[PDB]
RNA sequence: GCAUGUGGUUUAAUUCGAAGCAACGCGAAGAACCUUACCAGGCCUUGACAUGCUAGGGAACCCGGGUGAAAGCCUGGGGUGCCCCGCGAGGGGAGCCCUAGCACAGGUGCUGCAUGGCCGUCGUCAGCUCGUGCCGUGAGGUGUUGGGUUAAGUCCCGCAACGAGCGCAACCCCCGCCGUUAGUUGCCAGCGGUUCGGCCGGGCACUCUAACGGGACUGCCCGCGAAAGCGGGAGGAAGGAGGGGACGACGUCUGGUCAGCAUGGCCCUUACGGCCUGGGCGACACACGUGCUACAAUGCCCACUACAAAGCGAUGCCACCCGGCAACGGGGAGCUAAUCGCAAAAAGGUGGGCCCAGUUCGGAUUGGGGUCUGCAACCCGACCCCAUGAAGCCGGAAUCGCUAGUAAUCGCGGAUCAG
């Protein structure tokens, strides 16, 4: 993530299609989950420290 | 006489009423709910076990699973209700093992794999 | 690498979440974004305070940040001047009007997070890598602890080839899902690099 | 006919919260249908362990949104007393429609 | 018959609907 | 067998730029990047220069070539 | 199997006749677990035996199997930096399995249209000691005592 | 044959990394612009972002026009708050704005042999080790070994050792039996009515739903055995770890990764930065990886008909009606979702058609005509309809997976996401 594109991908665009996601935390853009809005790496990262509520480790 | 038959995610409401000898499942004739189904006959086996065919009626309901499983499902249920009539029946039932129920459940697809077992194929290792 | 962050594995039997509440599909991601913003200040300001945990109970409009500090006499400041500031500095961010309780840390030697830091600073203070570690582990043992442990990331004493210093005592059954082991993580930034301190503290049982 | 829905994240938190409504509802009210489970809706997350590139890694995360219901028929002004502001759970959200 | 995007299965596969697989 | 429903597209950049070349008769050279645009029966006869990836390819328009787009005349990929 | 001989799966006898031998054979026709289909094949192939022969298909079936069971076989072996075909007395278990299989592999190679048909004919020409079912049997043995020059390993 | 990844060749660019096993449908869980790091051309500099300083002008703010591909450049208007001061005029000031200079912002620019973290991997393999004691001048040894046993350094017997730690096991989740608590799911299970739809009453029994708890321990019987244990039986839903998960020791490979993030160090700072427009990542004489579709009658097609789970849903899922061959469109009800919807599961079953053909097998490719998303589908989107209807008749040497509800087969759901 280049600041030149984090803060950038945040300002409203001239075309609604142009608007993509980024991770609020890492700034990653490749694969954030809408639900949390965090980079797959990031998800794990916090998922672990216990910072994402109700977010447990699946087992079945 | 109710017994409860469950098999591979599919429940079977079993009802044995002293009658002529007919099975109604989910409202239809037994042999109509199972057309072309080879192992169909399988359900009644627990009955022909004690020479009690035709003396009861079978009001049976069923939910879930597949037709080719529900069969077994009823099969068990009938068996489980059959004890209510005569507990002493176990003597001729369990030797044939009709009061058993198996965890033949569909194993979970692990990741990295194409199924529960089937791994992916590498060529030039 | 192998292992799995101990805590993240225990939330379920013994180890609650750092921010417990409820949310919808429309608010979860939002709220949470804000959550992280909070600790973005606390971590910055309450460094020297001996900061520990950051419980975050939420509800309707109300909110409640509880702060486990080792040295409350700092967060509070003189008579209640900094706890005053922080609340405003806090709402400066969140337009929610929120509570900020403060709870002292009964024994900074049992709180692995702190413990880690303890080391960290020491390492930034150009101290002795090996010793630092041993010392720390004993502190933990003496007070209570049914077991402690520490680790270092690499470049012990600014070496050219990063290594890693091992050191523990008592039990640390990382595999026993009924432990209740604190696990801390530091990060001393140094002239030669970045090093990672990792604490571990066995405690109790069933 | 007070319909009380209880949606949460921890099943013990709701159990209590739910029980807390069951108790002070029979003392001042009348005939309660008891606490009932739903369903429960899960939110799976299939993420790769390593940040680099190892498809075969993957860690599995869930998020259970438990649902509990407690019905109260014949709602008195006395029942609404005990069940006015006598709550304690934090990670529990309630909504009423009657 | 799965590639035959103009047959029964043909559509069932692609999950599309058309003159060959309708909506009842 | 491609398709743009009801309302054929053409960027106003040159549309109301080329039409103004009608009030005067003919011109010689037009240069605009929008190769997004379809070609109109109202556009025939001009010599439009379209952008490649680096060059600006000049394209003469025919009475016989009204149903295609501009991009269809500007090859990007240099080959052989 | 490294640790044990591993137990042999026990099957459910036929709903019709009741011989497990039956169930075993059907399993062999069944492809893709469409056991409801393969069931039919066998039955309708039986019905063909009734109309085409004055005999109970149940019997016909066994005698056909009985006849293709090779009692002798080859099993390659590396002694001397070479492949020496060692002929060997086949066990009970392996016969029954080899039979049913060949009955099938052979059947589907018939010029006949309908599957059930192919079985039907293969089931007869078998009990008459011919066809290919028995040929895939006589051929193996035609290797058994063909290289019996090596039965000393 | 096609999809997809990679080599290589190509290109203004075809951005970058990954490389035997442990790279190759791998980061990338979503390249048309965007993303995007590449290439072209146009444009910008205290700069798209932080904190701040010295000098000069202005509340912020908002609405136009000119040029333009956009960005940018030029220009013009209305516009004038909160503080504190002696009434005024006006003066200093906080935030906010521009200008000129400065400190500095920024850099997916090198280095994973400078690093953190996190991961692959030997290896879920059964092992790695310590205290004390004892052996040895020592390095080291013993213990951890042998004989028996186990899935296991699992346990038994023995033995200069006795313990202990990391590991195995166990604690935790899902599956199978059952019990308690709970009844807007469920049912003539038992009764009353029907538009005979569990539709209504009415009822929680059953199904179910979910929270807690019971239940197997070789505990019982026969045999083998010094013991551990092994074989067989019984009762039991389940047997000897009942099935499946999560769970990876001390370390190895200088493993990967500075393009997720962070970080030592060197390198650029009117550019190695920043905005944009268009192109490219999709290039093709070839070559390999992963796969999909098929070569057909155990079959293909059309019709009527029956059983599933687990998920997702607000501008979102869309019942139903209508237009159209149809994608779709118009209309419009329900759902905030165990009570509405995505929905049809498919294979299967009943009927009938095909008659062994390159065919009613197969669906590549190409012409043509449309739908929708969206600023925009040429480069480079899916979908529908008509026509076209290719290779291909079961695959060289070689090579992969899988020991049971598995493999094979068949359909359904989601993530990302306008599509
Ligand atoms: Zn992130």
mmCIF file of C-alpha atoms (C1' of nucleotides) in Angstrom, chain D residues 3 5 7 11-12 15 26 32-60 62 64 66-69 71 73 95 97, chain H residues 17-18 23-29 117-121 173-174 181-185 209-212 246-248 255-260 290 310-313 336-341 415:
data_model
loop_
_atom_site.group_PDB
_atom_site.id
_atom_site.type_symbol
_atom_site.label_atom_id
_atom_site.label_comp_id
_atom_site.label_asym_id
_atom_site.label_seq_id
_atom_site.Cartn_x
_atom_site.Cartn_y
_atom_site.Cartn_z
ATOM 1 C CA UNK D 3 -42.289 -10.733 21.301
ATOM 2 C CA UNK D 5 -35.901 -11.550 20.258
ATOM 3 C CA UNK D 7 -29.481 -12.068 19.167
ATOM 4 C CA UNK D 11 -24.241 -18.703 24.074
ATOM 5 C CA UNK D 12 -23.752 -18.349 27.858
ATOM 6 C CA UNK D 15 -28.584 -18.129 28.252
ATOM 7 C CA UNK D 26 -43.168 -15.195 36.059
ATOM 8 C CA UNK D 32 -44.397 -17.568 29.611
ATOM 9 C CA UNK D 33 -43.600 -19.771 26.586
ATOM 10 C CA UNK D 34 -40.034 -20.226 27.762
ATOM 11 C CA UNK D 35 -36.741 -19.569 25.928
ATOM 12 C CA UNK D 36 -36.373 -21.094 22.497
ATOM 13 C CA UNK D 37 -33.351 -21.541 20.235
ATOM 14 C CA UNK D 38 -33.597 -20.891 16.526
ATOM 15 C CA UNK D 39 -31.420 -21.959 14.249
ATOM 16 C CA UNK D 40 -28.169 -20.090 14.679
ATOM 17 C CA UNK D 41 -26.385 -18.453 11.686
ATOM 18 C CA UNK D 42 -22.652 -19.030 11.002
ATOM 19 C CA UNK D 43 -20.212 -16.761 9.107
ATOM 20 C CA UNK D 44 -17.227 -18.898 7.802
ATOM 21 C CA UNK D 45 -13.849 -17.405 6.764
ATOM 22 C CA UNK D 46 -11.403 -19.439 4.760
ATOM 23 C CA UNK D 47 -8.078 -17.645 4.956
ATOM 24 C CA UNK D 48 -4.547 -18.677 4.031
ATOM 25 C CA UNK D 49 -2.319 -19.038 7.077
ATOM 26 C CA UNK D 50 0.826 -17.662 5.559
ATOM 27 C CA UNK D 51 0.862 -14.190 4.042
ATOM 28 C CA UNK D 52 3.041 -15.265 1.131
ATOM 29 C CA UNK D 53 1.677 -17.980 -1.064
ATOM 30 C CA UNK D 54 0.749 -21.459 0.054
ATOM 31 C CA UNK D 55 -2.802 -22.250 -1.106
ATOM 32 C CA UNK D 56 -2.673 -25.541 0.823
ATOM 33 C CA UNK D 57 -2.439 -23.608 4.158
ATOM 34 C CA UNK D 58 -5.716 -22.027 5.142
ATOM 35 C CA UNK D 59 -7.067 -21.425 8.642
ATOM 36 C CA UNK D 60 -10.796 -21.715 9.303
ATOM 37 C CA UNK D 62 -16.494 -18.946 12.147
ATOM 38 C CA UNK D 64 -22.006 -17.663 15.489
ATOM 39 C CA UNK D 66 -27.187 -17.151 18.236
ATOM 40 C CA UNK D 67 -30.951 -16.491 18.322
ATOM 41 C CA UNK D 68 -33.159 -16.836 21.411
ATOM 42 C CA UNK D 69 -36.853 -16.148 21.868
ATOM 43 C CA UNK D 71 -42.733 -15.009 24.513
ATOM 44 C CA UNK D 73 -48.692 -13.351 26.624
ATOM 45 C CA UNK D 95 -35.500 -5.745 20.189
ATOM 46 C CA UNK D 97 -42.194 -5.687 18.716
ATOM 47 C "C1'" G H 17 7.562 -12.723 -6.849
ATOM 48 C "C1'" A H 18 7.170 -18.129 -6.508
ATOM 49 C "C1'" A H 23 6.863 -23.174 -8.040
ATOM 50 C "C1'" C H 24 3.399 -24.166 -12.186
ATOM 51 C "C1'" G H 25 -6.261 -22.974 -11.500
ATOM 52 C "C1'" C H 26 0.558 -20.780 -6.565
ATOM 53 C "C1'" G H 27 0.209 -14.236 -3.705
ATOM 54 C "C1'" A H 28 -4.226 -12.669 -6.972
ATOM 55 C "C1'" A H 29 -11.381 -14.839 -2.327
ATOM 56 C "C1'" G H 117 6.215 -11.249 12.236
ATOM 57 C "C1'" C H 118 3.756 -15.113 9.651
ATOM 58 C "C1'" C H 119 4.193 -19.539 6.545
ATOM 59 C "C1'" G H 120 6.213 -24.167 3.511
ATOM 60 C "C1'" U H 121 8.983 -28.305 4.868
ATOM 61 C "C1'" C H 173 -15.754 -28.563 18.288
ATOM 62 C "C1'" C H 174 -18.572 -31.465 14.593
ATOM 63 C "C1'" U H 181 -34.770 -27.697 30.181
ATOM 64 C "C1'" A H 182 -37.411 -24.982 25.718
ATOM 65 C "C1'" G H 183 -42.049 -24.912 22.242
ATOM 66 C "C1'" U H 184 -45.017 -19.897 16.248
ATOM 67 C "C1'" U H 185 -40.271 -26.110 13.147
ATOM 68 C "C1'" U H 209 -34.259 -26.870 16.753
ATOM 69 C "C1'" A H 210 -30.122 -25.867 20.707
ATOM 70 C "C1'" A H 211 -27.978 -25.249 25.558
ATOM 71 C "C1'" C H 212 -26.516 -28.700 29.390
ATOM 72 C "C1'" A H 246 -8.683 -28.263 15.370
ATOM 73 C "C1'" C H 247 -4.031 -29.216 17.694
ATOM 74 C "C1'" G H 248 2.957 -29.688 14.503
ATOM 75 C "C1'" G H 255 13.559 -22.479 2.410
ATOM 76 C "C1'" G H 256 9.732 -18.037 1.103
ATOM 77 C "C1'" U H 257 8.356 -13.495 1.779
ATOM 78 C "C1'" C H 258 11.495 -6.332 2.478
ATOM 79 C "C1'" A H 259 4.945 -6.461 -3.251
ATOM 80 C "C1'" G H 260 0.755 -7.241 3.214
ATOM 81 C "C1'" U H 290 -3.545 -28.281 -12.733
ATOM 82 C "C1'" A H 310 -25.800 -26.343 4.171
ATOM 83 C "C1'" G H 311 -25.469 -21.323 3.172
ATOM 84 C "C1'" C H 312 -26.757 -16.213 1.532
ATOM 85 C "C1'" G H 313 -30.459 -11.922 1.249
ATOM 86 C "C1'" U H 336 -35.800 -7.191 8.279
ATOM 87 C "C1'" A H 337 -35.875 -13.492 7.549
ATOM 88 C "C1'" A H 338 -36.625 -21.676 11.762
ATOM 89 C "C1'" U H 339 -42.511 -18.158 9.651
ATOM 90 C "C1'" C H 340 -40.876 -14.515 2.831
ATOM 91 C "C1'" G H 341 -37.080 -15.551 -1.217
ATOM 92 C "C1'" A H 415 -16.604 -16.095 -0.289
#
